[PDB]
């Protein structure tokens, strides 16, 4: 069974998608506090 | 009381940011481990 590399490929794909969501959400938080600094004049 | 609240909100966004970079690092080490 050469599924080992296929499993590995998916597991890497899951982590890539996971990272994407975190990086995008992280950007929203940075933007959120910047907006707060703006709103605080 | 109001000016102290403004500080706290900025500390929370930091608590959240650090915890995200933490998860990114966890995801990174897991990814490296899948690459053997």
UniProtKB/Swiss-Prot annotation, chain B:
Q: Coiled coil where?
A: 1-36
User: What residue range is the signal peptide?
Assistant: none
From the Swiss-Prot or TrEMBL record, state where the protein is found.
Nucleus, Nuclear pore complex; Nucleus membrane
Swiss-Prot/TrEMBL domain comment: Contains FG repeats. FG repeats are interaction sites for karyopherins (importins, exportins) and form probably an affinity gradient, guiding the transport proteins unidirectionally with their cargo through the NPC. FG repeat regions are highly flexible and lack ordered secondary structure. The overall conservation of FG repeats regarding exact sequence, spacing, and repeat unit length is limited.
Family assignment from sequence similarity: Belongs to the nucleoporin GLFG family.
Its job: Functions as a component of the nuclear pore complex (NPC). NPC components, collectively referred to as nucleoporins (NUPs), can play the role of both NPC structural components and of docking or interaction partners for transiently associated nuclear transport factors. Active directional transport is assured by both, a Phe-Gly (FG) repeat affinity gradient for these transport factors across the NPC and a transport cofactor concentration gradient across the nuclear envelope (GSP1 and GSP2 GTPases associated predominantly with GTP in the nucleus, with GDP in the cytoplasm).
Q: How does it assemble?
A: Component of the nuclear pore complex (NPC). NPC constitutes the exclusive means of nucleocytoplasmic transport. NPCs allow the passive diffusion of ions and small molecules and the active, nuclear transport receptor-mediated bidirectional transport of macromolecules such as proteins, RNAs, ribonucleoparticles (RNPs), and ribosomal subunits across the nuclear envelope. Due to its 8-fold rotational symmetry, all subunits are present with 8 copies or multiples thereof.
Provide the protein name: Nucleoporin NUP57
Organism, by scientific name, is: Chaetomium thermophilum (strain DSM 1495 / CBS 144.50 / IMI 039719)
This protein's gene is called: NUP57
Where the shown chain sits in the full protein? Answer: 281 to 316 of 326
